[PDB]
Amino acid sequence: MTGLTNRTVVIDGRGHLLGRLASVVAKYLLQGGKVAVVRCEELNLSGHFYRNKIKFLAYLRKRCNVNPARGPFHFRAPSRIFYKAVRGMIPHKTKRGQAALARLRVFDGIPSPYDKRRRVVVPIAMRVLTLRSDRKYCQVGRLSHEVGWHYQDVIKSLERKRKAKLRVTLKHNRELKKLTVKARENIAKAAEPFNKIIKSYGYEV
Amino acid sequence: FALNSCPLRRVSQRYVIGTSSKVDLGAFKVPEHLNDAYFRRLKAKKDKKTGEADIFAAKKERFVPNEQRKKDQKEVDAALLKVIKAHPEGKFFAKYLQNMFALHSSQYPHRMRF
Amino acid sequence: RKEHGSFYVGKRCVYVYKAETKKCVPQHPERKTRVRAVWGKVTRIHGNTGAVRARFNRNLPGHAMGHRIRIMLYPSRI
Amino acid sequence: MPFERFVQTGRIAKASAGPLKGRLVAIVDVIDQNRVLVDGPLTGVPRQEYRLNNLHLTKYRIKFPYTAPTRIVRKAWTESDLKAQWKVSPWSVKAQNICKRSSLNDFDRFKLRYAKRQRNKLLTIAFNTLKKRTKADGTPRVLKKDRRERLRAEKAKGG
Amino acid sequence: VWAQHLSEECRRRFYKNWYKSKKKAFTKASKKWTDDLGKKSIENDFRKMLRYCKVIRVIAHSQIRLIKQRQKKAHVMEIQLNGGSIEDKVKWAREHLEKPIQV
RNA sequence: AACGCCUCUAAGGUCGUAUCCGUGCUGGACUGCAAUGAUAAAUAAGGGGCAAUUUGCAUUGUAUGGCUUCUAAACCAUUUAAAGUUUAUAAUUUACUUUAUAAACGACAAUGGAUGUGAUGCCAAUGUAAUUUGUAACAUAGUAAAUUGGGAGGAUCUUCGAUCACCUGAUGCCGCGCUAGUUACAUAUAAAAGCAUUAUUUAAUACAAUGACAAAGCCUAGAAUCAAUUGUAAACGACUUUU
RNA sequence: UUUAUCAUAAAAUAUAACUUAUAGUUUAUGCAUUUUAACACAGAAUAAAUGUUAUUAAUUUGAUA
Numbered sequence: 001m002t003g004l005t006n007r008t009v010v011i012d013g014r015g016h017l018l019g020r021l022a023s024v025v026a027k028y029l030l031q032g033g034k035v036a037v038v039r040c041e042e043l044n045l046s047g048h049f050y051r052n053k054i055k056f057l058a059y060l061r062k063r064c065n066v067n068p069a070r071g072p073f074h075f076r077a078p079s080r081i082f083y084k085a086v087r088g089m090i091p092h093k094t095k096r097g098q099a100a101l102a103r104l105r106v107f108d109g110i111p112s113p114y115d116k117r118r119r120v121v122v123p124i125a126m127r128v129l130t131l132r133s134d135r136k137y138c139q140v141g142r143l144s145h146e147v148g149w150h151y152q153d154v155i156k157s158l159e160r161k162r163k164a165k166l167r168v169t170l171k172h173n174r175e176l177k178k179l180t181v182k183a184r185e186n187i188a189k190a191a192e193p194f195n196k197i198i199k200s201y202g203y204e205v
Numbered sequence: 206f207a208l209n210s211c212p213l214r215r216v217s218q219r220y221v222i223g224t225s226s227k228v229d230l231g232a233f234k235v236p237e238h239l240n241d242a243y244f245r246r247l248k249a250k251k252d253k254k255t256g257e258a259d260i261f262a263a264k265k266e267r268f269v270p271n272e273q274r275k276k277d278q279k280e281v282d283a284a285l286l287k288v289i290k291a292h293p294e295g296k297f298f299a300k301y302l303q304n305m306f307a308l309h310s311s312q313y314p315h316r317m318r319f
Numbered sequence: 320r321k322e323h324g325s326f327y328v329g330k331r332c333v334y335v336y337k338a339e340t341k342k343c344v345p346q347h348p349e350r351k352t353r354v355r356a357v358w359g360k361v362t363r364i365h366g367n368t369g370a371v372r373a374r375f376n377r378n379l380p381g382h383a384m385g386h387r388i389r390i391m392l393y394p395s396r397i
Numbered sequence: 398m399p400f401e402r403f404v405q406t407g408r409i410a411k412a413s414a415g416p417l418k419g420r421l422v423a424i425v426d427v428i429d430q431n432r433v434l435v436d437g438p439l440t441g442v443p444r445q446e447y448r449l450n451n452l453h454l455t456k457y458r459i460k461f462p463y464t465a466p467t468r469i470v471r472k473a474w475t476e477s478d479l480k481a482q483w484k485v486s487p488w489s490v491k492a493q494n495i496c497k498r499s500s501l502n503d504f505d506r507f508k509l510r511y512a513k514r515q516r517n518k519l520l521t522i523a524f525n526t527l528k529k530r531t532k533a534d535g536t537p538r539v540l541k542k543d544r545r546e547r548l549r550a551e552k553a554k555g556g
Numbered sequence: 557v558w559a560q561h562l563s564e565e566c567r568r569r570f571y572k573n574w575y576k577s578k579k580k581a582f583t584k585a586s587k588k589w590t591d592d593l594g595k596k597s598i599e600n601d602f603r604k605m606l607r608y609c610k611v612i613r614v615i616a617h618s619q620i621r622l623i624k625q626r627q628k629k630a631h632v633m634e635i636q637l638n639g640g641s642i643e644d645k646v647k648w649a650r651e652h653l654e655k656p657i658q659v
Numbered sequence: 660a661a662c663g664c665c666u667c668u669a670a671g672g673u674c675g676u677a678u679c680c681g682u683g684c685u686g687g688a689c690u691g692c693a694a695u696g697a698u699a700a701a702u703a704a705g706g707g708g709c710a711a712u713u714u715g716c717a718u719u720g721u722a723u724g725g726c727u728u729c730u731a732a733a734c735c736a737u738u739u740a741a742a743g744u745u746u747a748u749a750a751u752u753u754a755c756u757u758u759a760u761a762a763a764c765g766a767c768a769a770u771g772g773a774u775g776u777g778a779u780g781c782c783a784a785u786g787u788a789a790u791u792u793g794u795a796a797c798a799u800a801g802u803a804a805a806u807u808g809g810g811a812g813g814a815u816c817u818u819c820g821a822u823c824a825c826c827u828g829a830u831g832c833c834g835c836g837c838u839a840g841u842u843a844c845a846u847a848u849a850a851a852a853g854c855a856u857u858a859u860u861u862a863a864u865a866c867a868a869u870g871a872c873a874a875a876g877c878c879u880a881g882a883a884u885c886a887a888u889u890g891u892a893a894a895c896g897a898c899u900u901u902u
Numbered sequence: 903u904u905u906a907u908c909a910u911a912a913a914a915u916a917u918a919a920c921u922u923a924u925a926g927u928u929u930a931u932g933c934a935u936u937u938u939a940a941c942a943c944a945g946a947a948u949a950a951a952u953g954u955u956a957u958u959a960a961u962u963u964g965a966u967a
Contacts, residue, residue: 001729001818002721002722004387006731008731031385032385032386032387060680107815112815112817113818116731116732118730118733120771121771128739128740128742130740132740133739133740134670146680147680150682154815160736163736166736167736167754170733170755171755172777173732173733174755179524179526180520182526183520183523183524184520184778186523186526186800187516187519187520187523189799190516191515191840193512193515193839193840194516196508196509196512196515197509197513197516200498201497201498202497206849206850208786210786213850214851214854215855216854217856219855220394220857221395222392225502225503226504239854240854241854243854244852244854245852246853248852268850270850271852275850295504295508296505296506296508297504301507303786303787304725304781305725305726305781305788308506309506309510309781310772310779311498311501311772312500314326314392314727315322315323315326316322316323316326317500317502319397319500319503338859342859343859346859348860348861350858350860351862352859352861354859354861355859356858356859356860393857398939399741399743400765400939401743401766402766412767412768413767413768419768420768452767453767454767456764461916461951462914462916462949463915464914464915465915465949465951466905466951467905468905469916469949488763489767489768489769492767492768493768493769494768494769495768513775513779513781514780514782515839517778518783518839519800519839523801523802524777525802536831537805537830537833539831539832540831540832541802544834544837547800547801547802548800548801551801554834558695558696567696570695570696571882572882572883573882573883573902575901578880578881578882580698580880580881580882581696581881583697584696584697596822598821600821604814604821608814626889627891627899627901628900628901
């Protein structure tokens with residue numbers, strides 16, 4: 001679409017670190033941003049699992065004592081573990097920084113059109129640019145399952161549904177490029193055709 | 206004006222972006238009676254030279270455009286068009302002026318060899 | 320980076336927006352008045368990475384934060 | 398050992414991040430985990446040291462002693478004939494968007510990016526170049542075999 | 557998917573005033589069994605359960621006028637079928653539309 | 660293993676609590692979300708949907724100086740900062756599977772981009788902008804489209820989800836309009852004297868979006884609540900019921 | 903410094919013989935050949951690379967003013 005860039009910037013959450021992808025996105029969302037992060041069950045957290053076990057299990061014992069319903073609502077999806085981050089990094093008690101989370105839709109298991117729209121990688125927050133060898137990491141997939149997320153195997157089967165018809169839409173497109181490289185043959189005697197682009201590219205011929 | 210619908214008007218160096226190289230104009234006469242002082246709007250005499258006169262609104266006293274100017278226009282755009290087709294058709298020589306600047310991928314406003 | 324936003328210094332940036340009224344004629348080249356513009360001028364560089372400051376004519380009402388202003392290309396050094 | 402890039406004397410390395418960007422230097426020795434010596438006589442770089450994070454490595458070793466002075470690296474640099482086989486290195490053509498696609502003046506661009514409509518208006522009408530099952534014929538090709546007689550015989554129309 | 561005829565005892569959950577009404581539910585959308593429907597209406601709607609769905613539950617009255625109350629207005633309830641290979645569950649529920657099942 | 664040896668540990672796998680987390684159970688993004696049923700009065704006229712709407716007025720949103728556009732076709736199928744990825748090839752094989760052999764790339768210049776990853780447009784002008792410009796000659800290429808029945812096809816809080824895209828039976832004949840190149844020819848338009856022109860940057864064209872009127876056929880003919888009753892309910896409301 | 907010239911050193915690795923080792927190779931357990939990134943300071947010769955002294959070619963080098 002059309003906007004300050006598009007009206008979306010779709011980001012895959014696969015292989016990224018949870019809090020560096022948050023402070024990139026909470027900065028960009030205050031620029032007037034529109035991101036829509038998908039596959040949130042794949043965000044990697046640093047440290048091993050019994051580090052982040054303990055820390056999510058300490059953030060859920062913080063409940064109000066007078067009436068626990070008022071106290072911190074502890075959301076247990078993977079996409080709400082991440083949306084909780086992008087609220088620590090956003091002025092959410094203002095009418096400016098509340099419109100900045102209303103650009104943020106955040107999904108976990110890549111649905112509904114964010115499966116055909118091109119989604120991009122944030123190399124400032126990738127794991128395998130940041131985190132060393134020898135260093136264990138986690139995923140928010142298993143963290144949310146071990147803290148009570150009842151839809152882990154829901155979306156894993158839904159992934160294999162859209163992984164399966166991806167092979168049907170690539171074998172539509174793998175042979176279709178094979179038609180183009182044959183369609184590229186009949187035009188080499190078009191008029192004077194390709195010479196004006198190849199004299200500035202030529203490295204792909 | 207034949208090519209681009211733009212007459213011999215007069216622009217500042219502030220409102221203009223000069224590209225890289227030239228177009229060769231080695232023997233052009235540049236018919237020097239086209240002076241800056243030669244081409245005011247002539248004029249608004251506050252009414253019709255009679256002095257202290259009457260007016261109705263919406264006068265058209267500023268844009269014919271000048272009949273002599275159409276003779277100077279057909280002089281240059283004759284001689285310019287014998288030049289500009291004889292160039293090696295590069296990026297900006299023949300049909301190559303005629304499209305509306307708004308740029309494109311992998312290129313610049315910042316730090317170009319423009 | 321700071322060599323990039325050092326290009327735009329001196330350019331008349333404008334912030335353009337809209338309003339309900341016209342209240343005014345077409346006085347010079349035809350004016351409808353549904354569109355409001357606050358003209359400005361970029362002044363200096365700001366960041367260490369290519370952000371920039373700009374003093375305007377009035378002062379940008381801050382529900383304009385995150386809305387587009389148009390940095391012009393004129394007045395141009397080459 | 399899949400014979401990757403080795404830091405060895407003198408594995409020929411092209412630098413990026415530092416002030417020798419775009420220069421093909423030769424390693425001479427190894428000072429550190431993180432630094433090397435550097436000596437490229439033909440590409441115009443005297444004997445510096447260099448941060449190893451800044452220079453990226455190529456597939457070209459060349460033989461000297463590790464105590465070599467520059468004059469015999471210079472002797473060796475030309476003798477194994479790097480200069481002619483590097484400007485045809487199979488993605489050293491893909492260097493040369495640095496000499497052709499970088500800044501690609503606006504006395505270049507239009508011509509180089511107006512022909513992409515020339516090329517494509519002759520490419521999309523080179524579509525439905527179809528074999529896949531239709532073949533034959535896919536009615537309403539009673540009318541379109543007249544249009545498809547201008548692919549095969551082609552005298553004059555169908556048919 | 558509804559069966560086409562329903563008891564007047566048990567179209568009475570759909571109304572809060574039945575004496576007052578004109579008894580117009582389910583008068584329109586029970587004609588789907590009487591049009592073409594074999595390419596268009598309902599066989600598609602039973603195709604959808606064979607493929608997409610995972611849980612098929614079935615909707616049941618209770619013939620509460622056999623109970624002798626003053627109530628006369630039914631109780632509708634979704635009962636889940638629990639027999640395997642949900643291709644079965646859509647055919648079991650396509651058999652027992654409009655037909656009673658006892659305890 | 661380090662540490663030629665031992666070793667529950669460094670990497671890796673395990674056993675495992677009245678704990679913790681979840682189910683089961685009670686409340687329900689007060690007023691979240693999905694499915695569904697009906698969809699008014701009248702039946703003279705009206706009222707209510709269908710609806711892009713066809714028919715104008717007239718506005719907003721916009722590409723805003725013809726288009727500072729974009730596309731809503733992909734880059735692994737457990738993972739690993741050397742880590743390997745592709746490519747053919749031969750066998751294997753649902754599968755780019757598996758295996759072998761050989762390549763390329765040497766974590767460069769480059770690749771963070773225009774492979775504009777079914778190959779974007781930056782326009783049919785054969786004078787292209789704040790309008791459209793005509794006709795022959797020659798060469799290759801040779802599209803885009805419009806009417807009839809069966810199947811397989813598609814659901815993640817949806818930008819329009821009982822429809823839907825392809826495909827066969829088959830109706831039929833655009834033979835309406837393709838385009839690229841070379842050369843010729845036919846006109847029209849376009850100039851806002853400003854010669855240091857900008858301004859509350861109009862706005863179109865077009866796209867799309869309603870809005871309201873006289874304009875345009877189709878379709879449509881239900882309920883809720885109160886009052887009375889109940890007593891599965893009750894401070895009151897509310898809930899369960901009944902004509 | 904560096905490039906460069908000098909004279910000797912004394913030679914610590916690189917071009918430059920042929921071992922053996924190693925597997926993959928052939929032919930009848932060995933050879934025959936193939937990669938030695940096993941690679942015998944294993945040798946000659948070269949780099950007089952390295953070592954010593956001395957001088958410098960647009961006399962070459964930055965910083966500090």
